[PDB]
Amino acid sequence: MDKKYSIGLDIGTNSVGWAVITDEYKVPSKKFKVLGNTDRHSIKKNLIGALLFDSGETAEATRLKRTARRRYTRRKNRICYLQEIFSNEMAKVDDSFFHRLEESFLVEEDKKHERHPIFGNIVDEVAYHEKYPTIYHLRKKLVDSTDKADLRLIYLALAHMIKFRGHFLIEGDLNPDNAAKNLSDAILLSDILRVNTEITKAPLSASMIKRYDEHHQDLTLLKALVRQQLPEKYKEIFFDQSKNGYAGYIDGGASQEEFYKFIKPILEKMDGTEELLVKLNREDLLRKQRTFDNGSIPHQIHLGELHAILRRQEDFYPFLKDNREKIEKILTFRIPYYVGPLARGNSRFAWMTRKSEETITPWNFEEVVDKGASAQSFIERMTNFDKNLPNEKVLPKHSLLYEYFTVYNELTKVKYVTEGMRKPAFLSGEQKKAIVDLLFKTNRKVTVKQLKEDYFKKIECFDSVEISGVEDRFNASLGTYHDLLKIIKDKDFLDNEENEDILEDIVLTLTLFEDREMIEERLKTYAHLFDDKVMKQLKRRRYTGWGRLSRKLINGIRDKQSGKTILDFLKSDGFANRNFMQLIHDDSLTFKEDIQKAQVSGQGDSLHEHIANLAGSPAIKKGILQTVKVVDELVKVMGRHKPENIVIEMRQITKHVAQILDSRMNTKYDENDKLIREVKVITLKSKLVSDFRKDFQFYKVREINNYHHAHDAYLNAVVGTALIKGRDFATVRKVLSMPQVNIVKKTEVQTGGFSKESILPKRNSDKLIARKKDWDPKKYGGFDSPTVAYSVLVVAKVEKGKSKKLKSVKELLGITIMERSSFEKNPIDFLEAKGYKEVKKDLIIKLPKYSLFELENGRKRMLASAGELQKGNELALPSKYVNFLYLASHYEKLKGSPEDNEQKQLFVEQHKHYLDEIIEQISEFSKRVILADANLDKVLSAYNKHRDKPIREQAENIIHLFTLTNLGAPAAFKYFDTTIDRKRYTSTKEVLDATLIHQSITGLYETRIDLSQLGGD
DNA sequence: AGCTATGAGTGGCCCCTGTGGAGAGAAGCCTGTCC
DNA sequence: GGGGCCACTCATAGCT
C-alpha cells in the first residue's frame, strides 16, 4: 500500500526547511541503512529537518576587479608604446636607461646595472634632485625653457603625463585662458587650477609649485613657533611616526584629515597662529602635491602641456617632430564604451567585429574595427527577445509599425452610441481608416471630445455620440509620424506602404545609435531620397525605448486562409473586430497554431538554465535549486511515489518555483494531451502561519536554535492541507517537541581571492606569500593570510629534529586556493614538495569546509579550516521554556485582548522558577559539548549577581545567552553589563581520531568513516 | 637532577577606498484596456 | 563577521 503523504517547504536566503507529513499530520520515522566501517549499521530518524548554507554572492566585485585589470594592462601598453617610440634615440644617449627604470623595484644586490635609475652616477642624481625637487618643476622648465634639454628628462615628463593623463568627463576643446560658455568654463577652471598671476603656458605646474612653496614656508614657521613655545612636543610632532603628527603625516600612514585633527588644538595653544588656523579651516595647510583632489583635472591641461613641450623641444630632436601626432594620440585615445574589449574571439565578454586581422593600435583603430556594427551588436544583445516568437528581435517603441498596431488595436474595442441605436456598435475598418487619416495623422494626441466633434459630428452627421472604453483621450499616439511629417514634409512618402522598410530602418537607426557620426554614416544610404536639410534634421531626432512585439508577429506572419496579418486584421476584421489577444487566441485562424508552434518547451532542459533565466538576487536562485534537490531526494526516500500535496511559502519568484515544481512533478499527459496534475503545488502567505502560531501559543524564538525552520515548514504543510481539505492539537504539540531534527550544514569548497589585499612590510617570517615568482618575501614583503580551499588528511613520515629522523605522522594539511590546481594535477608531487615522505595515496580524503566529525559523548565539531573548529551541536529546549521566554520577552509588548494579556502575565509570574531551570540546562549542555569552563563560570557569576532584576530584563539577557550554544562560529555577546569574549577552538588534533560523517543533502543517508583505524602508529 | 623545545593556550588586533559616463532588463506601487 | 597572525605564558615531552 502506498502511504499518502505531503511535503512542506520553507525557502529562504540561507535555509531551506523540509517536512514530510501524512494525512493525520504525523511525522513518520523510518530506519535507514548506514554505510562505512563503523558498527552502527542502522539509525532511526524523523522525516523532518532543515538545510543550512552560505549565502550566494553577486558578481559586482568580480566585474569591478576585471575592469581594473584591463585598465592596468592598457596603461602598461601606453607606457610601452612611448618607450618603443623613444628607443631608437635613447639607444645613442644611454643604452641601459630603460633597464634601470624597469628593474628599479629590486634591491641593490639583485640589480644588474648601476643602482641610480636616472643617470647611474650619484653626482648627477643629487644635482637633479636639488635642481628639480618635484616633477612639476621639470614640467614647467620644459614648458618654458627654449634650451636643448637632455632627452631623459623629456622622456620622464612625457611618461609622467601619459601615465596620469586625467579624466575625460568634458568633450571638445577647453580654453585654458578662461560667450556664456567662456564664463561657465572660467568658474569651472577656478577650482581645478588656483591663481595663475604671472604669465605661464602651463598653469597646473605653477599651481603645484605654489603649493610646494607655501608648504615649505608654513613648515618652517611651524617649526620655529613650536620650538620657541613648546619644546617638549617637538619630538612627538616631528619624530614619532606612530602618532598623527607631521612625522606620521609624511613618513607614516596618517591621512590629511587626521593630521589636521591632531594639529588644530595645538595651534590654538600657541600665539601667532592666525594665518595657520585660517589655512587649516580651508584645508590648505602643509598640503601635499599628490592628493585626492586632483580627480577634477581635465585631460586637456595635460594635453596642452604635452603639446607645449613637443613644440619647444622639436627643433633639436627631428624624431619628435615626425611623431608629435602619435604621442598626442597616445594620450587622447581611449576605447569607446560600445566597442568593448578588443578580443580575438577567445573571450566570452567580447562582441567586437574586426575587419582585418592586423594588430589593433591607437594609430590604426579606425581602419580595423567596424564601429557601426560594433555599436549594433552592443545594443542588440541586451534587448529582450519576443515572447510570442523567441527567435525574433523586438521592435523599437517609437517604430511607425508599432504605433499603427497600437492605434488599430485601441480602435478595435471602441464602441459608439448614436440616436436610434439599440446597442453600442464597433467602428468599421473604413471608419477606423478615416479616423486615423483625419485625426491621428493630424493630431499628436487625439481626445474623445475631438473625435466626437470632428468625425462623428462633422463627417458622419451625428449630433450626439457616446463612446465607451476610452477615457477622455486615446493612449496610442502617432508621435513618430508627426515628427517625420515635420522633418521630411512629404505626406505621400509617409503614407506609401512601399516605403515601409525605409522608414522602419530609419527609425531603427535613430534608436540604435547615439553618436551622430554613425547615424550620418548609415543614413547616407538614403541620402538620395532626401535633401540635405531633411537629412540633417533626421540626424538630430532621437528615440529611446523598445517595444514588446516583433515585426514578424504584427505584420510578418500571414494567415494561410486569408493572407492578412495581425495588423491587417486590426485594420479590418469584419463583424468579428478581434483585438490582438483575440487574434492570437483565435482557433479559426492559423495564428494560434503558428504561435503554439513558436513556443518551444525545454527538451531535456537543464534545471540550472531555467533557474538562471529567473529574475532576482542569486541567493534566492541558490535557495530554489537547493529546494528542488531536497524535493527530489525526499521523493527518492518515500519509494518514488510522488506526494499528493506540496506547500511552499517565501510574488513572481514564488510562482516560478511553483512552476518548476509542477513541471518536474506532473509530467504524464492524458489522451487529450492535457497535463495530468497528480501533484498540487500550493502557495501560502506567512501571515496565516504567524496567526496560527499566535492563536494556539506555538511561539518561536529565533535565538535558541535552528529547529524553527523545520517547525515553520511543518506548520506550512499542516495549514495548507487543513485549509484545502483535540487529536490534531495533541499531534502538533508532540511533533513540535521532538528533540531529533536533521540539521545539515552544506559542505562547500571555498573560492575567491587568494588572500588579503593589503601588502605587508618585510619581516622574517615564513607565512608571507611572494607577490612575484622572483620576489623573496623576506626582502620585498607580500600578501598574507591565504584562504584554504579544503583540507586533506595525510598519512606519511616527516623528517623532524636536527638529525632529520623519520617519524610517522597523521595530520590535516590545508590546500590554499592558489595551490589548488597544482595539487589536483598531481597530489603526490605536491605532498612531497612539503616534506612528507612515504605518502599513502589511498588515504587522501577530501575534507571540504564544514565537514562534520563525531566525538565522545555525542560531541560534534565542524571543520572550519585547517586549524580551527566550530560548534556542531544543537540545544534541544523543551517547548514550555520557549513559550515562557517568548511571553517574558514581549511582556510589555503583547498585542491582544486585555484578558489574554493578563492571563499571559499571570502565567509568566507563576512560573518564575523556570529561570533557574533554563540556567541549569544551559550549564549542563555547555559542560557536555561546549567546554567553555571560564566563560560558563563568568555566565553563572553574572546570573547570580543580577538575580533580583525584573523578569523582562532577565528574559532579554537570557535570550542573548544562547549565543554561546548556537551552531556555527563562536561569537561574543553582552549579558547585562559584563561582556564575554569568544571561545575559539584553535586545535584540530582531537578530530584525527574522530568518526567522519558524510551526509546527503537531507542528512538521511549517512556514510560514517572512523579515522582512528586509518594510519595507526 | 639540568636544560631545551614546542605546542597549546589566551588575549588582542587586523581586514583596499572614493567617483564619473553609457546601455539593457525585471520587480514592486497605481490607473486604463483586454484574454 | 570570522578566520589569520603575533606576543606571552605555561605544561609537558624530549634529550642529556
Add this chain to the structure above:
RNA sequence: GGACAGGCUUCUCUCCACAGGUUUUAGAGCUAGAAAUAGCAAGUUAAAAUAAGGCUAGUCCGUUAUCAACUUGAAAAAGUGGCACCGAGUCGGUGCUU
C-alpha cells in the same frame, strides 16, 4: 492567472575611464662619542607591481554560478540504501519479509 500602454521607486548584468592607498628602491644626513647614545639638519617627489600566472599569444583570460560518499564517466551526466508497530534528550526497542 496572463498580456499591452501610461506615472513613480528599487534592484540585477555588461563596457569605458579617473583619483588615491600599499610595497621595494633612488633622493650622499651632519657633528661629538669605541658604542649605547645626545644635539642639529631634512621631510611634499619619482620608477615598477597591484590577485601567483595561463595558452588560445589576444592591447585576451584569472575572485559569479555549480560540488555528501561508492560504481560508470574528460565533463555534463547516469546508477546505488526493506516494511510495519510501540515509545523519546539528538534517537531506542520489537515483529515480519529477505
